[PDB]
Every structure is written in structure tokens, then in C-alpha cells.
Amino acid sequence: MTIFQFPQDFMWGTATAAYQIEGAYQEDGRGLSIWDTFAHTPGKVFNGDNGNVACDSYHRYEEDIRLMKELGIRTYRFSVSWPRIFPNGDGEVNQKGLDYYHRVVDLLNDNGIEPFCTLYHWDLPQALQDAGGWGNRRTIQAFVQFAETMFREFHGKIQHWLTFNEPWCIAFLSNMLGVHAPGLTNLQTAIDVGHHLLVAHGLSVRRFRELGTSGQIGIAPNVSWAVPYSTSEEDKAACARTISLHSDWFLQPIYQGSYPQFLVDWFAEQGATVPIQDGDMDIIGEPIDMIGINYYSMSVNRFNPEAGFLQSEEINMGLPVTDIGWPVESRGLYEVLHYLQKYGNIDIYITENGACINDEVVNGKVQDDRRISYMQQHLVQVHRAIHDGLHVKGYMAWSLLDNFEWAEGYSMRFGIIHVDFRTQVRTPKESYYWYRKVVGNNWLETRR
Amino acid sequence: MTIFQFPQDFMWGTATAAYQIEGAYQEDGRGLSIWDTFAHTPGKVFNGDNGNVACDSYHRYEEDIRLMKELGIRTYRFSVSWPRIFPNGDGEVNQKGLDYYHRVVDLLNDNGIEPFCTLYHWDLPQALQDAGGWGNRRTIQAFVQFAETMFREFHGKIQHWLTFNEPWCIAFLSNMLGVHAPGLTNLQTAIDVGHHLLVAHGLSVRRFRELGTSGQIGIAPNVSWAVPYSTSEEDKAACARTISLHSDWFLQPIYQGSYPQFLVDWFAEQGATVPIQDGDMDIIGEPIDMIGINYYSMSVNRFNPEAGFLQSEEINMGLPVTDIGWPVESRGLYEVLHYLQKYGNIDIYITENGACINDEVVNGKVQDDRRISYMQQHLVQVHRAIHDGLHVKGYMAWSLLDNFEWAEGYSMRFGIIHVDFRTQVRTPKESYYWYRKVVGNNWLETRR
Amino acid sequence: MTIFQFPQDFMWGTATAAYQIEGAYQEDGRGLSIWDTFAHTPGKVFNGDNGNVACDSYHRYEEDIRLMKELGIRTYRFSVSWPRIFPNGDGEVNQKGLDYYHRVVDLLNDNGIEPFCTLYHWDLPQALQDAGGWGNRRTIQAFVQFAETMFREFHGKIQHWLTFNEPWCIAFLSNMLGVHAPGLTNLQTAIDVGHHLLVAHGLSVRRFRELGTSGQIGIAPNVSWAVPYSTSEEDKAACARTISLHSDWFLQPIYQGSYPQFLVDWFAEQGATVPIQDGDMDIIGEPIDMIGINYYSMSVNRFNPEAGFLQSEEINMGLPVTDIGWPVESRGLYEVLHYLQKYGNIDIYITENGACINDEVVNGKVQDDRRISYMQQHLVQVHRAIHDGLHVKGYMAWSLLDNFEWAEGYSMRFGIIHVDFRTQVRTPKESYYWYRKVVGNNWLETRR
Amino acid sequence: MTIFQFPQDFMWGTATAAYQIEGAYQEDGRGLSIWDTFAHTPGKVFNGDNGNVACDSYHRYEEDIRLMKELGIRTYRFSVSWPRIFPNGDGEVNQKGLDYYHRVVDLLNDNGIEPFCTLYHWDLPQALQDAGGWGNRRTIQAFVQFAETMFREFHGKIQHWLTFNEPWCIAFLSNMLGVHAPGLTNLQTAIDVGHHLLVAHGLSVRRFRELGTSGQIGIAPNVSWAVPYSTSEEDKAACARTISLHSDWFLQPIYQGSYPQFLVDWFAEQGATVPIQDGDMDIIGEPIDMIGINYYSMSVNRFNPEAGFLQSEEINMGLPVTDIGWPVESRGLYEVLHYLQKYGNIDIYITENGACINDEVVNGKVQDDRRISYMQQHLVQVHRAIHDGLHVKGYMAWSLLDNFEWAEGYSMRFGIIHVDFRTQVRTPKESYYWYRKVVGNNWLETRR
């Protein structure tokens, strides 16, 4: 009914992460990450699921890349298992680790797919976590040597780099709420991890510039959007806190060399402060070429004193929800793209966007109409913002494959391709074929 | 997950219209209305459907009222067939017309249901339409004699009155776009009808005050909400035009004694002007106790020169739609309730809200979960605004019964009770039972 | 997509026959007809079905008439059981016979339904068949006394009369092919019966005029249409023979005081001649106000010497067929209406038209979409001919009720209302509700 | 029930077109056709479908030919992608283009299948369309060099040639109604294209004779049949206009050296004339060995002034329709075969006949009974005309494969073999196996 045409050089993609798809968790000298530890602890992951085999992408990468070529996709966002390159994050490199990523990347380049390399997608080596992990400044040095090895090793092979994925998850979800590895629950150690992340980021960007590594580099925050239930100041502040901790808390330092004062005041009142040393802010402010934003959902939030450390209560507006229980409201993606212009018209990529739709293989196909419906609403909002002159450069569907969805295990399916975890059979879903017509035409026809 | 508690004295209701449910179109001296004429003209109504029998509520009113009592509802909004009281609108009254409404209203009052009486729900007698209908200032005097008869006839029996329902439909849909009776397509005659409506309204309110008739009186505009695709001025103006013609065009005169200048300028440029005579604005500005608003849907609109007389193009955002193809975005009801505060914190009733869900009787019941889902999102927005201190006094579900949906005939089901047009059997839908617990508890819990 | 508007005064109806629906075959002094005898003989009727109970319309006439009123139909075509009025056709009248038809007819007139009375619908009393039946000139006088009694008995109560139904069936199907009662197979006795029919017709029309009985009278031939497979003369002649024996053989005498010479020559060569006495042609030529035509199907026929007594072989064109195996080609009705203009622009009624669709009651209703599809194509052809200025005055659906379909018994359903022969339950089919809107609107819209 | 025996040497076939099945739209130096351009323009083709891969017959031709051999078919009608031989239609030939058609044709001849080569099946090179395409007389020269190359290249390999397929579509559908590539809407440029087509045809036939190329050559018009709703002259003229523009407009010049005067007068009154130069009619009148006729549907048409440029309104006779909404009335094929005898008893081939039936693979088979039913009715009409002594030499089912149905995309299935456009899997439908018994026996038994 309406036609939405995309810019000529718009980067269509699909996204995965090492621990979620790779498997082969003990092969070719791989050391245990914090997620190996976490998935092997009873009660941490639904149904006791772990990434031991996952989608076995370590061996099946040839098949996955063939399905990407047939998709006619332009970029493929993957993540490097740190413990595959530095099993202890010690400085003793694993050449078998590198060899795998060279095979993967070399195939992508031969098939005219541009690699989009996330260095850190939560697989911190357990060796570093034994010594305090991201709460220890020693990890900052460890990450930079990892970042450096990859920059040196895959120079000219990779033109698009992200240091970290979803810092809010790595810091606050992993160390405040205890939902993700390593599953702590302390305001102060989350803030510590958060700050050390940014220093490790800055220094890795610095080395990239010093090495004159090929391409462009950035960070990929998960981005929350909240809207106030009331015209009340207290409800507006609750939304501000929710929005700012996901985006502003990591982006204001990188772009404006400071933390959001109102959140520093909020945390200080809970007896937490940012462990800021001399030259830390200078390092963090090291200019970056683009950001990724991961958008999934938006919410209506009311002030509530008993509603967690941000005193921001999500309200059930009665909206329809994905199989993981997230409401679908595409206009949040439009709102957050406009909100992020406070940092200027930066080059933004949608590095993750997708829906949890648990439809399985019936008569040889997956009839995931609800995933097509989700994607349709969200790609309108991407066009809508490009048309407002915002520099949205690309869109990457989460995910290429049904994968290990962290603490939900294999129970929540985000993939555009169905994966059977008994047989490792790939079945492209209806969404795969619908998307193949949205990337190859480079326009979208909204109709149902 | 979230609980929404309503004010103590909040008015729960259901809504119908005479032509849509009554039937008995030739019985007890009823004269033909413009809708009888329109429904009897081939190509005007889908499948050649007409209101000749409809839900046969003329004879089955006892059954419908029993189903309302079991619903535990507090108000009932109905409309009077003008041509049942004045078959020619000539001043010769029909006692059989009045007797029916006395039987209906007397039952409602005996069952502790408060009647909410809409005088005009598009039933214009054909006798007056032969003379030019609402385009002829003659109808204004005709309507006031009708209004007066009802005021005097049902004084103390009825405490809630609306002069007109959806003026935008009566004027612009009926006389500009030609979709509704009497199906003309002339900018000038629509504006004429629109103006004459307001004069007839003012004078009827005046007589109500002069008669010291029991209760309170108002008008019930259908209310559009549009949001711009772009931050562009042209796109914002297109939305303003769309929003203002539905609400502002009838409400600005009643509340601020003028027409929206920007729409007068817009129309003037198409060679149309308002036939405003001396003291017309004074009549129209006669104070009213409250308004009804009919809300259904919301839209995203772009400026487009070839997109009808308002040059406002609705965009398909890929959102899910009701069976009549309207998208559901409850937050429009919240936005428009805030927008209407430009006339101050007036007493507002939701006189119509509902979804077209065509589920039929299967294993003895209707499984209209999508209607419950719709109602749930919208009743959150009603709570949301009451909580912002807005004087939203009540909510009336459109509709009590599957009825004659005008130009769609019986093909679109809005009812909360299923009606088999073959047998005139009433089957309360799942929505009826869901709604019965919301109005009886006087709170709502969101889930699904 | 296309709208077909009918003339203001167009007569909408349904049609039944006494033996097919009445039942009560021994009640109130009814004498056995030839069909009672035939249905009681093994191998004559499929499954040994008979009209002993049928639809029990003798007792259930009140119910059937109510369903007609709700249909909004204008005419009702029924037939009189001769042996109910004259059990022996001997001149001793049965007052109980008449009383039933007075009850039926009086209800029809009270409900504003115009009776359309067929005197002979194959009910010949067995007493007359013992004496040679229609092959004996004795029956001619017997029929006229019957015709007369009814004319005098129901004067002013009935305004539309047919002497005979489907003469071709009564004569050739019943006495040449042996398919229908009394099931003979002799060219000569068929031609005899055929001739005696016409004399009985002429004399009955004469008495109607002499009695100055109220209304108009005619005959209702079943009408075949055949089209040649080849442009060959022999194939064209085969069609002519097939067409002429159904229509021309009874209509040429009534309208042009002769038999089709080419068929007399054809039969004469098989040693058959018409037993025409002095003044017979004069009697037969008694002017009539209108005809009925019964149309169902059309065919493509080849000359074939071994293809029955008419040497006309029907060819299977692979067309789709009704459940009784007749192909649907509506354009035959248009062709035959034009062909019959050889007798001038006479007043024609479609006294029978319908399809055999054996859909049963499923989830409280009959989904006989193929019957609606059939009726739709045929009512276009009725409009098409009226638009060519042909005097087609009415249309009567065969049948109101699933009935006793002669030699097929209850296995072929032609009814527009379902009848459960187990329980005598009436269930209006989808066709009933579809037809109800065509006759009430008095226009038709083609779709599906 | 009836047996229809075909002549001994009757040519059974199946038909495809290059753009509809080939795919490989950029491979081995292929230049863009006007259909590549048209399919890549948003809003031109349903669902944004294009022939980029189609059935991938460029690579899968071996499989398709094996399925033809198992069918026991005698002829295979295919079309040559002009832009595969002359990517710019410039005169620089592509040897890789020729090599493909030599591989295809050589396989057909080895398998005893007779190639039936359509030179032009709408794939005009975009290079020529940039310069005005068929509206430019330069294209005439371009086509003749193409025609010539193929004649020289495949002499003795191919014995059956068609210059153009469906001229009415190429001219009027493509350039008057704008439905097909290149999607113009101008009476005059359609007539231009139409005339230039005929000159290009004549000159190509001339070269064929001069080259003494092996076999016989013709043209394949799509053939409409219309029948008047009324006996009125104006309704008869409307049909004449509809019939003549499809057939007579291209056939009267080839066979009688003139255009239908009544259509020249009709067009002249709309300010259009045929751009006829000296020797044009002489060229067009170059004798031809046979025609193809493409028959699908016939219609009932009424005169209507507002019903397009021919003022001929199709009426919905309520007949059943194929999934693409065309009514099935086989007797049109019989009527048009008789009508075409105005050019004498020419050798006619049914080069296209088929139904759109969208049945998909269920339990390993396609249950396309409606396609068998369609084919059955139409093959009776082919026998019927052969039996009238008409020189109908052959029948080619449209289509071998589900293909790219132009502006309907992949949504409308005409194939006798099912194709999955995700996996390129061929599944012979029930129609394939039914037809295999109609070609191999060389008789047909009409029964259902």
C-alpha cells in the first residue's frame, strides 16, 4: 500500500555472536569464558542449556555463509571469542583461534560479504574473571592486547569494527541484576565494570589509529526508550533515568567527555561513585567513526520508589508481545534515532533488530508471519529517519540463526533461519525469503 | 501484570444507533430517512445491505435490555429515529414513534440503566432532503421542533442528551466524499450542512435550558488523530488539517465563537466559504455541559498535493489492523484527550470506542480475543488521562450488537454481542464476559 | 462487479408439486395416483423411495408458508393432487381434498403471497389409468370436470393458473422411455397421451373463459435447448428434433393450430400418427394469457442413428455438472427465450429453474454455494432477455423444499430449504438467505 | 463418457518464454531488456517480483527437457532472449547467448522434441527502448538483424518459427493501458509500435525466404472473443471492436493488405492514424505458412461510452473463474477458430492455452483437478473444429512450468509442473500425468 525506497549504498546485514552460535567450546585450545562457567552453574540458564555445541558454527560456517550469499546480504556482523585467541587473556596467543577467524573472514570476502567485527560480545576469559574481571583495571590492558592482535591480524580483511556490544548488559545486567555472566548484584562493581569498559574502548580505538588499521571503528550500545505514563516531573525523570543508563551513560563520556550528572547524583546517593583516574576521560573521548544501536522494544514507565535501583516501573499498556514477552512498538526506534542527534548527526547502524517468534518447521517451512510483521514496522521507522536526513547507514537483523539466547537458552528463537539443535539442520524461515526481497530490491512495500 | 482502578462514579456503557439496530423501517407510520433511500440505491452499500430488519431491536428491545442488565452496565447510549417521531419532519407528530421510545426508556430506568439519548444519528427524513436537507436552513427549524418534542416528552426519564453524532461524517463524509447518505461530493454543500448543523445544535441547547429539561446536554464529534511522517512543516500542517476538520471545525465555534482560520483560508482557496448569517456564532456558542468523543484509530500522514481535498496522505506503517483494515494505536486516544484541553478541562465521555473483529459463533460462543485486546489497550489510555486529572467521565463500547455498519452493511462486526441476521439470535461474545468483569469490578488488569 | 436491476412488478417465487411435498397419501379419502402405484413397484424409484410422507406438507403447510413470508417472495407455485379432489376422477368430489387447498391458499393470501396453481403435476388418479389413462379420451372429460371444480372453488382466491406441467415428461418420458409413471415404452401411446393432453388443456381454458374465472391461465412446458457439435445438416436436424419435441410439439398447436410437420414425418416413418379428430386443433388453439417455461440444462448433440427414437446423441463437453449430473450452461435459457419469440413476444414466466446440490446441514446451516452460483448465472440470463424487450414476467426457484425427485427419490436435493426426512426439520440453506436479498432488493450483484 | 480421437500427426506441446523461466539475467553478457527495467521499477509488478532467477531454466534446461521426454510431448515452444544475442540490439553479437540456445535446441532434437522458436516474446533490449523502442523505425532494422542471425545460426536445427507473440499485448497492453513493459499510455505510440511490429515481421519473413531457412514461419496473436449482452447494434459493434483489435488489426494487413477500416475510423476520431509509408503494406502482406493463436477466455460485452478507448464493457455473467479471475468458457475457442476462417482454412496451432490454478505441493503432489477440468473442455473444442475440417495442427499447454506471470509476478501459477522459487524443485502436477495420457494415447475421454 506504501512503497519505502532505501538509499543506494544502504548496508543490509544479518548479526551473530561467537558464544551463541560457534559451539566447539573445548576445540583447538579454546579456554573457558565467563559464559561457559555461568551456563555450567545450575539455575543460571533456563533448562540448563549452554553454548557447548550451540549451532556448531565453528564447523558449519561454510553452510551459514552460503545461506547469506543466497540472501544477497551486504554485511555480516559476527563476534570473536576472546578465549579462542587468548585462552587465559594472558598474552600467549592461540594460532588455531586466529586460523578459524581467517577461514570465516576469507570466505565472507570471497563471497563479497563485508565482515562487521564485534571484538567483545560478552565472552570474557574465566582466567581474567578469577582476578576480578572487568572490575580489575588489569583486564583493560588484557583487552587492548586482544584488540591489537585482531587489528594487526585482520588489517585489510575487515573494514568495520565494534569494540563492545551492549555495554549496559555487560555492566548493569551482568553485575547489578545478576541475570547475565558473571551474575553479580552490586551497584558499585557494575559502575566499575562500566568505567573500565570505556577505558578499554578508548585505548583500543587509540591503537587502531596508531596502527592505521583499515576501515572504521565504533561501539554498539543497546538503546532503551521509555515514555512517561504521566505528565508528572517524577514520571518524566524515571523515563530519563531508564533511557540514559543504556545510551547516555556510555555515549556522553565518548562524545562530551562527561557522565550524565543526574545519574552520577542518583548513584552517589546509593553510595556509588565512578572510579575515574587521571587521563581516563581523555582516553574515553577518543573520536569514533560510527555507533551501532541495538533496538528491540520501548516501554511506558511511571516513577515507583520500590521499582529497582532506577525507581522506574514499566507499565503493561496491554500491547501485543513477542514470544519472549517484549511489546512491539516500532516508533521507539524512530524516537531514539532523533534523541541520539544530541551527539550530532553521527553515522548510526542498526547492528541488532529482531523479534522472538518460536514458530518451528511444519510441512518443510517456518510460517513466522509475526517476524515479517515485526521487521516491516521497524524498517519503516529506519526509512522514516533516513528521510529526516539522519545518517542511518545500515540494518542488521538479529539473528541469522536461532542461537543460544543467553539465560533463556534455546527456548527463545530470534533467527531468520531455523536451526534444529538435534540435527544442526538449517531451514530458512518465511522471514528469510521476505527479507531476501527487502535487501535485493532495496525497497519495501508495507501491506497485509 | 498492571492494575488500573477507575473513579467511583465512572459511567460504564454500550452504544447503538436507531437505523443500525431498530429495523421495522415501515412499521407504525415510520417515514423514509436519507439512509433508507441510500441503502435502496444499488452500489451505495456493500452487498446491497439495508436497515429494513437490521437487529429487529424495534421488537427485540426487551431481550437487548436484559443482556445489558446482566452486563451490569450503568449507561445505555441509543439514538432516536427522527422519521419515527416526525415522518416528514413537517410538525405532524407520530404517537407510535414516541410510544416505542417510552417502552424502551421505561425498561432501561426500571433496570437501573441511565439512558444516554443521541437526537440525530444520521436518520434525516427524506421529506426534508427533497427540500435540500441540511443545506437548506429550513431543516434547522425542523430539527429544533424534533429536539423540543423529545425534551418535553422524556423530561425526568432521560438525564444525558447529545444533539448530534459525528458532525464530520454528517457534513464532509456524506456531502464531500459521497461515502455516506445522502452521498453528494461538493465542498460547498458539505460546509453549508456543517454550519447549519451547528446552528440547529445551538438552538436545541437553548430550548433545553428554556424548557429546564432534566440532566445535561452536549455534542459527540468523531475525533481523528494524525502524526507527521516527517519533522517537515508541510507534513505537520497536513496532520493539523486532518485533526482540525474532525474536532476543531465544530468545537472551536461552540467553545471560542470562531472557525479555525487556517481551514477557512484552505477552503476559501478552493472557492468555498461558510454561509454565516447575523447572530449565528452567538447561537453556536451556547454553553454545553460536556462532549462525547468517538475514537477508533490514529494515523501517520505525509503532505501530498493529489491526496484529496485536505492534501493529507495516510501512510501504512505496517501496523496490525482490525478486520475493517484500521490500525490499532491506543495512544491516539491519550494524545487527543490532551489536545482537546485547549477548550479547557471539559467533561469528556468516550461515547464510541471499538474494533471490527468478524469472529462468528463456534462451539456456542465467540472467541473475539482481538476485541478484548483492543478494548484493554484503549481503557488503559482512559485511566492514563483520568490520572493526568482530565475529566473523562465515562466509556461506551461501540457496539452492544453487531449492527448495520453503514456503507459496509453487515460485513463488519463491531458488536460485543453476536447477532445472527438469519435468526436474530443474540450470542454474547467473549468480549461481553470480559467487559462485564471490568465494569462490575470497576478496575482493569492487563495481561495476554 | 455488475448490477442487474429487475422491472418494478417482476414476480419472484418458489415452486413445489403436490406428490413431491404433500405426503398424507391415504389421509382424508385421497385415492391412489399413478405415482403411488409406480413408487410402490420395485425397481421404478431409486432406493424404493415414495411420496407416502415426503415433506409432510399436508400437515406442515403453516411452517412452509411462514418461511415463504420471511423470504419476502411474491408468488407461490404449487400443484393440486387430482386424487384428493376426485379420488377416482369419477365425479364424486372429496370435500376434505378442497378444505386442505382452501386452508393453504387462504394462508398464502393472508400473507400477501399470490398463489400460482398448477392443476396437473403428474398426479393422474389410478382409477382413470385402469381405463387406459391419458391414452383414453375418457380422461379428457375427467380432467375438465376437475379443472372446472377448482376454477369455481378458488375463484377470486387464485389469479394465476397452469393447466399442465412439462407435457413432454407426461407423454414421452412417461410412455416412450418408461422412466416416469405409468412407465410405458410405446411411441404411439406417448403421442396419444400428448394429443389428449392438449385437448384437455384447450377445453379447460374454454371453461375458464365461460366461467369468467379470476386471473390468467396458461401451460408450462419443460424446454430443452440443444446446439450442434458440427456445422453438418444432420447434427443441426438432431438438435431441431430434440428442441421441438419439448416445446414446439405442444406450443405450435396452441399458437399456430398445427404440429411441427418435420416431427410428424419423423414419427410417421416409425409407424406413429396423431389421433386427431374433428375440431381438436380448434380446441387446442384456444388463446392463453402466458406460458411457464421450466429450464435446467442445455446440451451439445451429434446425429447418431442408434441414439434413441430422436437419433440425437448428447456429447459430454467436459463441463462441470450438478450432483444429478446435468451440466450448467445458463446461456441456453437466453437462447430458448429468443427461440420462443417465433410465437411472438408472449408473456413468459420461469415456473421452474434450479440445481441439484446435495449439501446437508453442517454446523447449523447448508453451505450450498454451488446453488447460489447456479441461480446467479441464470438470473443474469433473465435480466439479459428482459433488457432485449422480451416479456419475462417472473422467476420461480425449483424448489422451496428438498422433495421427492420422482425416479431419483430423496437422493437429489433441489430445495432452497433443507428438509431432514428423518425429523421433517426445515433448515433454510445459504441459497434461501442469498435469494431473500435478491427478491427483497429486486436487483442482483454478480461476484464469487 | 465421450471419446475424442485426434489426427495421427497432431502436434502435442507445452510452451515457455525466455524472461518468464530463464533467470540468469546478468550471466554470459546478457543486456537488460525492457522487462528487467519494468520489474525493477517499484509498483510495476505485484510484490516487486522480477525475472532475475525465475525458474533458473538457463542452468536447469536439462531437467526441464527430461520432464518433457517423460511427458511424451512432440513440440516445445520456447522464446529467444533478444538481449542474450544482441545485448544492445546494436549488431555486436554475443556468442555465449547463441551457445545456450544451441545447447537447449540440440538436446530437444536428440530427445526427438521439435523446437518451436518464438523470436520476440517481449524482451526488447533497453538500449533500443532508450531510443524510442518499437515507436522508432530503427528497431525494425534491429529486429531483422536479430531474426536473420537466428535463421542463419539454427538453420536445419529448427523447423517451426514465430516472429512475434501476442502483438495486441506488445502494442496496446504495453503502450495504451500501461500494464506491461515499457508501461506507456498513449493511443498513438501503441498504434506506432503495432505498425512497426508488422513491418519488422514482414521483413523477417522476407529474409527467411531469401535465406531459404529450414521449415515454416508465422505470427502468434492472442485472440479475444466477445459476445453481445444485447441484440442491439451498439453492443454488437463493441464486441466487434474488442475482437478485431486482438486478431483482425494484425491479421487483416498480413492476409488482405489492409487495416480494419472501422477501427481506423474509430482511432482517427481519437486523433490517431497509422504511420504507413510506401511499401509498408507490401512488406506486411509477405505470405506466412501458419499462425499461432493464444486462447484463454471469452466474454459478454455491452456498449459503454466510459468503458476505455474501445467503449466495450465486459459483464460479469456470474460464471466460475480461474485463480487469476478469468471465466472459463471453452466454446470461445471453437467460435474464434470458425471466425478466423475469414482468412481461409489456414494452418492454426494453439500456441498457448491454460488456466491459472494456484494449487501447491501437498503430500508430495499437486491436486490441480481444476486445471485438468479446464484443459478437458478446451481440447474438446480443438477436436470439435478439426472435425469441422479446420486445419488445427497442434496444441501447446501454457505452461510447462509455473513461471514469472509478468505484472502478477509468481503469484499466478499456469504451469503443468510445479516450481518452488526457494529451492527450484520441479513437481509434475496431476495435470502433467493427465496430459501425459492425452498426448501418448492421442485420444481424450471426457468424464467426471
Ligand SMILES: CCOCCOc1ccc(-c2cn(C[C@@H]3NC[C@@H](O)[C@H]3O)nn2)cc1
Ligand atoms: C527480572 C526481569 O528480567 C531482566 C532481564 O533483562 C534483560 C534485558 C534485555 C535482554 C536482552 C537480550 N537481547 C538479545 C541479545 N542482544 C545482544 C545479542 O547478543 C543478543 O543475543 N537484548 N536485550 C535480556 C534480559
Ligand SMILES: CCOCCOc1ccc(-c2cn(C[C@@H]3NC[C@@H](O)[C@H]3O)nn2)cc1
Ligand atoms: C474509500 C475510502 O474513503 C474513506 C472512508 O470514509 C469513512 C470514514 C469513517 C467511517 C467511519 C465509520 N465509523 C463507525 C460508526 N461511527 C458512528 C457509529 O454509528 C458507528 O456505527 N466511523 N467512521 C467510515 C468511512
Ligand SMILES: CCOCCOc1ccc(-c2cn(C[C@@H]3NC[C@@H](O)[C@H]3O)nn2)cc1
Ligand atoms: C436413463 C436416462 O434417461 C433420461 C432420463 O430422463 C429424464 C428427463 C428429465 C427429467 C427431469 C426431472 N426434472 C425435474 C422436475 N421437473 C418438473 C418438477 O416437478 C421437478 O420436480 N426435469 N426433467 C428426469 C429424467
Ligand SMILES: CCOCCOc1ccc(-c2cn(C[C@@H]3NC[C@@H](O)[C@H]3O)nn2)cc1
Ligand atoms: C485493469 C484490468 O487489467 C488489464 C490487463 O489485461 C491483461 C490482459 C491479458 C493478459 C494476458 C496474460 N497472458 C499470459 C501470457 N500470455 C503470453 C505468455 O507469455 C503468457 O506468459 N495472456 N493474456 C494480461 C493482462
